[PDB]
Design a protein around this ligand. Structure first.
Ligand code: HEM
Ligand SMILES: CN[C@@H](Cc1ccccc1)C(=O)N[C@H](CO)Cc1c[nH]c2ccccc12
Length: 396
């Protein structure tokens, strides 16, 4: 007899604020049996120590969820490519993109990103306040970076960024509208992969089709999934953390000017903005136990699902000194904004480089940068999986 399931999500995720139950649950050292919009009931994992465990312990599988009605907040189960398989499939698939995303491999992109940010703030200079930082800086920057690396025509952004938001939708779209766009995009990706047989390219997608076509290293659906997720995670998720990180600094401007006055702080400010800012609206993808695991006062049984509350982990007072204060100068930062262990975020370095350069130049070229509106009147996405302001008007 397991306890009565509580309704999760606890409520809408509002701006960057965290529901109070997360902190109560950490203090309790128990998991919470929850009942979610779709799929299985789960245990919600809130403590940094335990989200570490569920995210990478081998007794918690992420392929298991494919044989189940997966505990989730979206009406349709999303196909997560390398995010939804175990070894040996995860090792096979991740090997194909490991080096292009490495620290050394991403650093060779630093010129181009920097040239792209200069150009992006060149226009702002000429055009003058007010500016929506989202439409004029954040979306181009993460949109062009990922589209150049991956070979996806950024001229096509008018079409596919309609569909992109069907993968992120909790309550913003009906289940039939969700399924319609999801195939619209797979068709689009599947067509891109076709042209790369006709006419190979020198981008990351061009080599993935070579890898299937002459090494037989993946399935055609695994190739389309890997390609989808790499565009999903770079277009929207990168933009939302940067948008969100911009909204923080501009509402706590003594940190902006601290980072302004000390640019050598940039790698620290980037790690802290990944931790402080709750990008994940509620939880990350669920894991099913494959044998019996005891944690959070619970003997979680084989076949039962856990939901890792990454943003709660990152406020854990037993890991982070003063966890709900923004300390850009924090030196050691074992956060989980990029997950933990086996599925640790492939694009970790590309997000660091983008952020580092973007904050550094935005704050450098515009020493007067301030919001052009009351922070409470900045609008935020409603009913989506990643939290982001929809508009960031600034003046200088
Ligand atoms: C601010 C931007 C981003 C954030 C906050 C973020 C966050 C995360 C998190 C938390 C996970 C682990 C999920 C889990 O274990 O439940 C993850 C995994 C992953 N991320 Fe990201 N991500 C970002 C950008 C990107 C980009 C730009 C790419 C690639 C272009 C990317 C590709 C991936 C992939 C492929 C995985 C799965 C890795 C694996 O299964 O081995 N992400 N990310
Ligand atoms: C419970 N997934 C949520 C929360 C989340 C989890 C991880 C990162 C960001 C956000 C989500 O927004 N997932 C989004 C929308 O489904 C897509 C996504 C983000 N990172 C991915 C990595 C691989 C495949 C898909 C994604």
């Amino acid at each position: 007899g397991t306890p009565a399931p509580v309704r999760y999500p606890f409520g809408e995720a509002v701006r960057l604020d965290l529901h109070p139950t997360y902190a109560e649950l950490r203090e309790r050292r128990t998991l919470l049996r929850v009942r979610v919009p779709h799929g299985d009931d789960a245990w919600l994992v809130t403590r940094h120590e335990d989200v570490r465990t569920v995210l990478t312990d081998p007794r918690f599988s992420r392929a298991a969820a494919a044989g189940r009605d997966e505990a989730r907040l979206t009406p349709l189960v999303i196909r997560t490519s390398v995010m939804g398989v175990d070894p040996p499939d995860h090792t096979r698939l991740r090997r194909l993109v490991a080096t292009a995303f490495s620290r050394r491999g991403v650093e060779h992109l630093r010129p181009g990103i920097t040239a792209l940010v200069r150009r992006l703030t060149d226009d702002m200079v000429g055009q003058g306040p007010p500016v929506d930082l989202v439409r004029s800086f954040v979306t181009p920057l993460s949109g062009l970076v990922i589209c150049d690396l991956l070979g996806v025509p950024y001229a096509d952004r008018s079409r596919f960024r309609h569909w992109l938001e069907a993968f992120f939708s909790i309550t913003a779209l009906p289940a039939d509208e969700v399924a319609v766009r999801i195939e619209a995009m797979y068709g689009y990706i599947a067509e891109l992969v076709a042209l790369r047989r006709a006419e190979p390219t020198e981008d990351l997608l061009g080599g993935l089709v070579r890898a299937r076509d002459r090494d037989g290293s993946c399935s055609e659906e695994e190739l389309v999934d890997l390609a989808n997720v790499l565009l999903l995670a770079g277009y929207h998720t990168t933009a939302s953390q940067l948008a969100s990180s911009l909204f923080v600094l501009l509402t706590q401007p003594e940190h902006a000017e601290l980072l302004r006055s000390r640019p050598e702080l940039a790698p620290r400010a980037v790690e802290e903005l990944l931790r402080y800012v709750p990008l994940i609206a509620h939880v990350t993808f669920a894991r099913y136990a494959t044998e019996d695991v005891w944690l959070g006062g619970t003997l979680v049984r084989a076949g039962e699902a856990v939901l890792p509350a990454v943003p709660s982990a990152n406020r854990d007072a037993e890991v982070f000194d003063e966890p709900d204060r923004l300390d850009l100068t924090r030196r050691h930062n074992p956060h989980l904004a990029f997950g933990h262990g086996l599925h640790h975020c492939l694009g970790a370095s590309l997000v660091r480089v983008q952020m580092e350069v973007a904050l550094t130049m935005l704050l450098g070229r515009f020493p007067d940068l301030a919001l052009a509106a009351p922070p409470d009147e900045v609008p935020w996405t409603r009913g989506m999986q990643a939290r982001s302001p929809l508009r960031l008007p600034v003046t200088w």
